[PDB]
Each structure stands twice: as C-alpha cells, then as structure tokens.
C-alpha cells in the first residue's frame, strides 16, 4: 500500500478545503487501492463564512480541528508530515487553498504560501514523488517553485494571466481532463474551478489520482 | 434521470452531524444516477459541538442549517420547506446527528423521539408510495416513524439491532457491501460507516441504496 498525503485546508468551499473535492479524492485513493494520509496546518483559519449566506462570521474555528472532520478524525498537523514516508501528496481545492495554505485569495500574484507545505512540496518534487494540485489550489504550484511549469486552473482568463504573469505555462483544460508537467511530476485539474456538478468534478478528480498513482509507482523503481 | 432526491442533513461531520463522507457520496450517486438532489437540515441549533480529532465537546454552538450548507456548497433549505408533494424520493445519510440532530435516539435509544418536520415528512412520503433510503445509524428513528414493523438494517451489530427489534423492527443482518429493502413499504437501507472500513466500502453500498431508491422511485 502506498501512502499518498493530502493536504486538507478546513471543512468548507469558503473556509477552508471543498468537501466534495477531498472525499472525492479520497474515494478514489481508497478505490485505487492505496493508503490516504492526512494532513492540515494547525493554525487559527484566516476567517469563518456562513456557507448558506456567503457572510464572514464573528468567531474562530482552527484548521486542523475542522479539516478532522472530513476525515473522521484520521489526520495529523501539517508539521508532522515527511516526504520521506509519503509516496505523493494531493491539494484538493477550495478557498482555503488560497487563505489558509497562502494567501493568494488576498496578495495574488504576491502571494505566499504556508511554509510547512512548501517545504513538503519541494522536499516530494526534489524525491522524484508526484503532485496533485485542483481547482485554485495550482495557484501555489508558481510560489513553491521557481522553475516554470504546466498547470491548470480550467479555463478562466483572469486567473491563468495571473499564474502565467507568476511564471508559469497555463494550459487550457476542461473538467473531465487533467494537465500533466511530465517532467516534474505534476498533474492538476480544474475541479469546481469549472465543474457544474459533483459528477463533473469526479470525473477529473479520479483522472487526477489515477495519474498522480501511475506516476507514484513507475517512480518507486 | 431527472427526478427531485430529497437529501436530510444534520450537520457537518460525524460526531456533530451527517457523516461527510455517506453525504457526499449519497450526492455523488444521484448525480452519477441523473437525478437531482435538493438538500435540507433542519433550521436549529446543534445538540453539541465535537472537536472530530479529539473526540470531545466544545464550548461552542453552531447551527445545523448553517453547518450543513458547507457539505452542500450553500445549495440547502431549511427542512420545513421540504414539501413531498415535489420530491420523489428521501434519503437520509448516517453520522452521529441522525441521533442527535434529527432524533435523540443517542439518548434516549428505543425511548427516543425523531425530528417533528422530518417525521412528518418521512410520513407524508411513504404514504404517497415514494421510496425511503437511511443509512448508518439513520434506520434507527424509522420504528418511531411508523407504528408498522419494518424490515431494516444498521448493519450486524446484535445489540443496535436488539434495540430496533424492540423497537417493533424486523432487523436484517447485513454486509457493508449490501441493501435490505422493505419492498412493501419501499424503504430500503445500508450498514455504512456501521461496518465500512474504509470510504470504498461505504460508497459500494450507498451506491446500491441510491440506485435502488431511484428504481423504486419510478412509479
């Protein structure tokens, strides 16, 4: 059984990581017979919205906590995570992707993101591991690394101008397909970023880990 | 295709509400299948807050509504808006609010008492012939649904099932992988995370629940 780390960012669209993108991703690590394992930062989240209204909300709630909800209690602080004992690592999206794994939804283009993800990130990239980043999570991918690389966020002008003006090479992409960087290892999909429904973003979320799977093994030699 | 699932949530995560992963793999499969889910929580306060990596409860209060919009990307009303005449069938997934939440057979077990609205409901459904799908530990509040016995399952655990049977239930032993229909009634249940394992092994039976509700749902 290989283990494949998944980077989870709360427990909600505008909170923190879009539910249906982690379960469907861990639907389909577990469909495809490998071991999930689980991670969050544990740190206070950016902010709290009321997912039916769309408003702030005035009171606090920590990643880590939240994020152990999605997975029924089976997930470990971000910090404890070692490349060396992950065989990949998936960033399924939301907009905690982009306020409490960076801060791209704030500075943009002058965005940072989380160190201990980074870190990971690179230590993976740097073992030849594979990466799998959806929906506006590949916004990261131009912060964590400096080279240039071919990544997805579906088919939004605006946000590929930004990736692109981050240095990197955006490739149009359509719900049910993914982008593959073969080089470094990096496979993304636009997931809720163009998806209409839950089968939808499925649809390229399984294409997603099948590939980031495939790559894993092929590189455990 | 085309036909309105009624979906029951009752909050967002196991211990506090509806088990995230029986949920969106319960909206998965309607949407594989061609139907459309439309989701309610009841408009309420949580009975408690759980920290899931603990396992302890938190000083803190959150709303089931509310909560359970996060699993639904805000696409969710509030259970009294739930009208059977437009639905064609309910489901409602497991996790510890379905005995918190939307019952409180936590607490009070055979003794318990399920949510007015979705009593009401699960009634008005039934008796109109649309097909019924709870899983987990959901079954538990359909003897206090209807006076009449049922066939159902909440997976192989002797002494839940004891409960329902004294309950005035006609418990079915069954694998994480299967269904127990009630063809007369046309309910139909799946063990989930009452005997899963894993996330797969739960979606091979909420998948089998989803299809055979929707089949029951032609009519």
Redesign the interface.
């Known amino acids: 059984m290989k283990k494949i780390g998944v980077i989870l960012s709360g427990?909600?669209?505008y909170?923190g990581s879009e539910?249906?993108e982690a379960?469907?991703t861990?639907?389909a690590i577990?469909?495809s017979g490998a071991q999930a394992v689980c991670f969050a930062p544990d740190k206070q989240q950016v902010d709290v919205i009321?997912?039916?209204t769309?408003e702030a909300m005035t009171?606090t709630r920590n990643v880590?906590?939240?994020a152990?909800?999605?997975?029924?209690?089976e997930?470990r602080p971000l910090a404890q995570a070692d490349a060396a004992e992950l065989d990949a690592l998936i960033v399924p999206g939301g907009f905690g992707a982009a306020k409490n794994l960076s801060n791209f939804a704030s500075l943009g283009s002058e965005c940072t993101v989380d160190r201990e993800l980074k870190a990971l990130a690179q230590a993976m990239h740097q073992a030849g591991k594979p990466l799998g980043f959806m929906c506006i999570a590949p916004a990261m991918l131009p912060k964590i690394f400096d080279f240039p690389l071919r990544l997805t966020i579906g088919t939004d002008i605006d946000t590929a101008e930004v990736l692109e003006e981050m240095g990197a090479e955006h490739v149009p992409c359509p719900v049910d397909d993914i982008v593959v960087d073969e080089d470094n290892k990096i496979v993304t999909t636009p997931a809720?970023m163009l998806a209409q429904?839950?089968?939808e973003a499925?649809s390229g979320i399984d294409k997603l880990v099948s590939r980031v799977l495939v790559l894993a093994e092929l590189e455990h030699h």
């Open positions: 427990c909600g669209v909170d539910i249906h379960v469907l861990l639907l577990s469909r009321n997912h039916l769309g009171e880590l906590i939240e152990a909800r999605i997975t029924r209690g997930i809720y429904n839950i089968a499925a």
